[PDB]
Amino acid sequence: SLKKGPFVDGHLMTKIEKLNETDKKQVVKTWSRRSTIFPQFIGHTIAVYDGRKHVPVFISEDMVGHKLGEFAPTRTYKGHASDD
Amino acid sequence: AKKSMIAKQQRTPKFKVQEYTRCERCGRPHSVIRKFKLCRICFRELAYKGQIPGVKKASW
Amino acid sequence: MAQVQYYGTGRRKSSVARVRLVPGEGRIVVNNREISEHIPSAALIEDIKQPLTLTETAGTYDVLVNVHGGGLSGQAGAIRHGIARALLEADPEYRTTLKRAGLLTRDARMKERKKYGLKGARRAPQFSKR
Amino acid sequence: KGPVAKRDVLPDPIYNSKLVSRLINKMMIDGKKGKSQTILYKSFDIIKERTGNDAMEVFEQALKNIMPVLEVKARRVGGANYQVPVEVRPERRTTLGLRWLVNYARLRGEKTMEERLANEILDAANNTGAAVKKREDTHKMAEANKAFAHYRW
Amino acid sequence: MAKQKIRIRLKAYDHRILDQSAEKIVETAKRSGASVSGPIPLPTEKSVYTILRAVHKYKDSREQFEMRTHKRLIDIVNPTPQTVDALMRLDLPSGVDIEIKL
Amino acid sequence: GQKVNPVGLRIGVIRDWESKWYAGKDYADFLHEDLKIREYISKRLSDASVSKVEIERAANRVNITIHTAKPGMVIGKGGSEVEALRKALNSLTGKRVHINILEIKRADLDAQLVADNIARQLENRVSFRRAQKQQIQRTMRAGAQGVKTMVSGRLGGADIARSEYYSEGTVPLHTLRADIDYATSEADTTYGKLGVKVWIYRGEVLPTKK
RNA sequence: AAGAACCUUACCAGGUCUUGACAUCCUCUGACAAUCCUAGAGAUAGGACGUCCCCUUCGGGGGCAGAGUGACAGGUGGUGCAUGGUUGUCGUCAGCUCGUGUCGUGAGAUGUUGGGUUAAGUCCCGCAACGAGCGCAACCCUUGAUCUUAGUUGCCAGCAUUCAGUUGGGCACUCUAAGGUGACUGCCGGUGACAAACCGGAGGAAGGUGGGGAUGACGUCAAAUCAUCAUGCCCCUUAUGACCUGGGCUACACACGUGCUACAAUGGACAGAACAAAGGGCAGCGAAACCGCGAGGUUAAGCCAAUCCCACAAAUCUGUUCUCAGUUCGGAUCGCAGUCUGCAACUCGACUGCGUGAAGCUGGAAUCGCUAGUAAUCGCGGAUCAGCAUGCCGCGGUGAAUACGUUCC
C-alpha cells in the first residue's frame, strides 16, 4: 500500500465494530477479500470467499498488515501424476 | 456479445478508470489506438477508402 | 570584411560542418577548441587533416570551422570533407590531383530505416524448421 | 557473379602503412576503433621497452613469418573427408596470419593484453609460439597429403 | 525601431491546398498594403503508423501509413486596416489552419 | 495480398480524398460526423443511388457535395426533397449545412454505378456470365482505354464456390499515373452473398506547369 | 495481444432479470432526469426530497421514460469442408495468358522456341508467325549534389552585446519546404552483324536497373480469420441472453519456441570531460526553486509548441583504483523499509532504499542471421497506455571481417 492508509470497503468496519461492542457473533462470510486486517478486528473468524467455497479463517495477533484474503489460496494443488 | 459490450461502454462506468477505448464503426475492443479511437482494421479499410491526407504509403 | 577567405560546407551521415580557410598559422579551430583537444587524441584527427598534406604541402592556412550533428568521428569526417571542398574552392587547378585523391563526393550513406519484421533493418532474429 | 571489388583501408598515421590499419580492423571488438588504437600504441610502446628494436621491423618479420605457404581444403568426394592442399593467396596469407595471430594472442592468459600481444608478435619474430606452431601444423597437413591435389582436383 | 507586427500562420495536411491558401492569403496582403513578407518554410512533422495486414496472425507482414503536418508563416510590416477588412472574407480553402496574432 | 487495393494507391499522387478537412482540437469528432453522413447517404443509396459524395469542412461549416447519375431523385419536385434532407442532416450535425448536387456525364463509365448495377442484376438472378458480358459491352459503349471486372462467391448457386473475371483493354494498376477507378459491391442472394469488384482505366494523367 | 490487478473477458463460482443490457412498430400515459436515506458484497429493491419542459384553439409536435402487448431484439452459440471481406505462401521468382493465323484425326502445339545479351518473357537478330493483355521495368516517395523563390520561434559568419544567439543587427551560411537542375551507355576507346549489350576510361555530387522503401502477375496450399465487420444454413431463448461480486485467463512435476542479462581486465568501480537524431505534449508536457540517500513529493514559470517542456544522449575519451578469482565478475532469489498510478496493488503492477549474493569462468549433437554503413554493439523516442514494454515499431552514435567459387546442401 502507500499512506493514509490501508483501505477496507468500510462495511466490514461497521460490522466488526458492532460485533466488537456487543453480541460477539462468530463466523461470517465476506466477498471483499481486499480489506486489510485491523487491531479492532482481532480474534474474529471470517469465511473467506475464494470463489469455489468459503474458507474460514481465525485471526491471530500476529496478522494485521497481511491482506485478509491472502490467507486462503484459490489455487488447487498440485496437481501432478507420479509423486515419489 | 458486441452489442452488450458497446452498451456496457456507452453507459457511464462506476469508476472513471474503467473506460477502455473503442471505435464507433465496429464493436471490437482491444488493439484500438487511443489518439484516433479507430480499429486497426477499421483504420485499415478506411485507409484504402482514404479518409485523411496524406502519403500513404511507406515514405521516409 | 577582413582578408579574403574560402569556405566549404561538408556533411556526412547527418553531421554538417562549415570550414573557413582564413590564412594564418594553420592551427585548426573546431567549436572554439583545438583539434588536439576537441577530440583527444585521436590520430584520426590527422586523417581529418590529411587532404591538405596530400596536396603539395603546405600553406598552411588557418581553419575556423563550426560543426553540428552526428558523433565525434562523423563530425570530424565532416571537418575533413569540409576542408576538402574548401581546398577545392581554393584554386580550380588543384582539383586534378584531387581526382587521384578521391576525397570529396561525401557518399551520402547513412544507416538504413528498419524493415518491419526485422531488428537490424536486414537481420532477422531467428528461424527454425519444425 | 565474378570477382567483387574491395575497398582499400584508410592508412594508419602511425606507422604510416595500411597493414597496421588492417590490424586496427582485426584486433577491434565491439566496433571500437579507439580501443584498438590504445592497444596498438601501447603495443608499440611495450615493444619499445623490452629488447630494443624498431617495431615496424619486428612486425614485418613477424607477419612474413606467420603466413602459410599452402593450405588444405576439405571436400567429401566419397567416404571420409579429403583435404586438398593449394598455394595460398597473399591476401588470404596475411588474413590467416593476422587472424591466428590475434586469436592465439587472446588466449595467452597474461594480465595485460598489450604485453601478451607483444609476447606473441615476438614469438612470431622468433619462429615460435602458438601461431608459428599452427602454421607449422598447416605445413604438416599440407605437403604430406598434397598428392591428391597434385594436378587433379 | 522594433515593433510588434501581425504574423499570420498557416497549417495543413495537403500542401497544394496549403500553398494555394498561402498565395490567396498573401494576395490580399499585396493589395491595399505594403512590404508583405513571403511564406517562409517550417520543418513539418509527420506521424508514422504501423498496422497489421492480416485480420488474425501473420504479424511479420505489416504496413506503414503516415500523416505529415506542414506549417508556414507570413508577415507584414504595415497593419493596413483596409486589407484587414478585406481579410475577413476567405472563399478558399475549406482545409486550412490560419491563425492571426499581433 | 494477393491483391492490394488500387484505391489505396491512387490517392495523393493522382486523386483527391473523398473527405478533406483540417484538425484540430477534435480530429475524431469530425470523422465521426462524416462517417455518420456516410451512414445516412448509404440509406440514400437504397434507390436514389450515388457514385460518391465529396466532403469539406471549415469550422462550423460543411460541404457535403453529391455527384449522382440521377440528380432528380434527390431533388424531388419543387426541390422539397433536398430541403427535407438538409433538415434531416442539420438536425444531426448540429451545424449549418447546404448539400450540393452534380450530374456525371456518361455515368456508366463510373465504377461505383456499374458495380452497383451488376450487383442488382445479381439480385435479379440473371446469369452472372451474361451480366458481366453486358457489363463489358456497356462500358465499351461508354468508351474507355481499358476495363476489367470480377465476381466472387456463389454463382448461380452451383458448386461450393466459384470466382470469375472478364476484361478488355489495358488495366495497369502498377502504373502510378493510371488514374484507375476502383469499386466493390456486395450482392445478397438467398444462396449467399456475391462479391463484386470492378476496375476502370480512365487513362494516364499528364502533369501541368505554369 | 498496439498493455488480463477490477474492466477488458469470452470462461468458472455465487448472487439476480425475462419483450429484456441493446434497436424498431403498437396502444398508452407522462417531460426525461436526478438528491440522499435504508438493506445488501455488488447487482438492485424499500422511502422521502424531487421532476411535471418546449411548439399548438385543443386533435396534436418533439426527444424520453414507464406500462402492457404480440412481433422481435440477443448469441465472442456451431459451420473459414457454404462464403463475402481481409491476409500469409512459393516470391519482387519472371513468368502466366489472349486475339488472329498456321499445323495436328484428336487432345495440343506454334507465338512464349533458337542465337547474343540482361536482375527480368530485358533488349536485339533470326524463326510460320504477327500482335496484344496481366507482371518485371518505367511512372511515386525517401536519400545524396546544386540553383532559384522564401528568412521566423530557426540560423551567427562578418559587426558591436552578454552568464547565455541572448540582444541590437545580419537573413550571407548552416537549416527549413516549393519550384528547378542532374544519369540517359551519353561522351570517348575496344569487343560485337555496323544489332542489343558488356568491359575500360573520361566527365560528374551520385554511373551503368546510384542506395532504400512502396509497387506482390496468372495461381498454388478446400492455407488463416464465422472471433473485426457482414452473413447462407443449423441450434438456444424466464437462456448458448443480460446484470453483478470474486476468481481465472499468470496454474506447475516438465518439454519446446522466442528475447533479455551475464559468465569479466579491449574489463569492473569511481571522478572529470565530450558528440546526436527523430518523436511526443493541453483531461498534457511540466522547467526552475525547495524537501527526501533514493523513488518521488511540495510548489510553480513556460508551452497548442523550429519559441517551452518531456531531456540528461549512451558507448567513447581522460585519469584514479582492483590484478585474474565464482572475483570490487555477474546479478538471481528472498527479507525489511519506502514510493508512483488506481475505489482498490493478496491473488496478479511498476519503481526505489537497505539487506541477502542462485546458477553461470563462453556451452554436446545440432542450428540461425548478415556482402558496407550490412553484420557487431551503445543509448533515445513512440504506438500501446490510469498504472504496467527484456515485446513491437522507429531514431541516431560507434562501426568491421570475407566473398577463391558453383564441387557440395
GROMACS .gro file of C-alpha atoms (C1' of nucleotides) in nm, chain G residues 23 43 71 231 238 244 254 356 392 403 409:
model
   11
  762A      C1'    1  -3.294  -0.138  -3.184
  782A      C1'    2  -2.642  -0.623  -0.854
  810A      C1'    3  -4.398  -0.910  -3.313
  970U      C1'    4  -2.379  -1.344  -4.321
  977U      C1'    5  -3.755  -1.674  -1.768
  983C      C1'    6  -2.304  -0.808  -1.056
  993C      C1'    7   0.827  -3.074  -1.702
 1095U      C1'    8   2.059  -1.147   0.104
 1131C      C1'    9   0.687  -0.427  -3.138
 1142A      C1'   10   3.321  -1.325  -5.099
 1148C      C1'   11   2.347  -2.858  -4.919
   0.00000   0.00000   0.00000
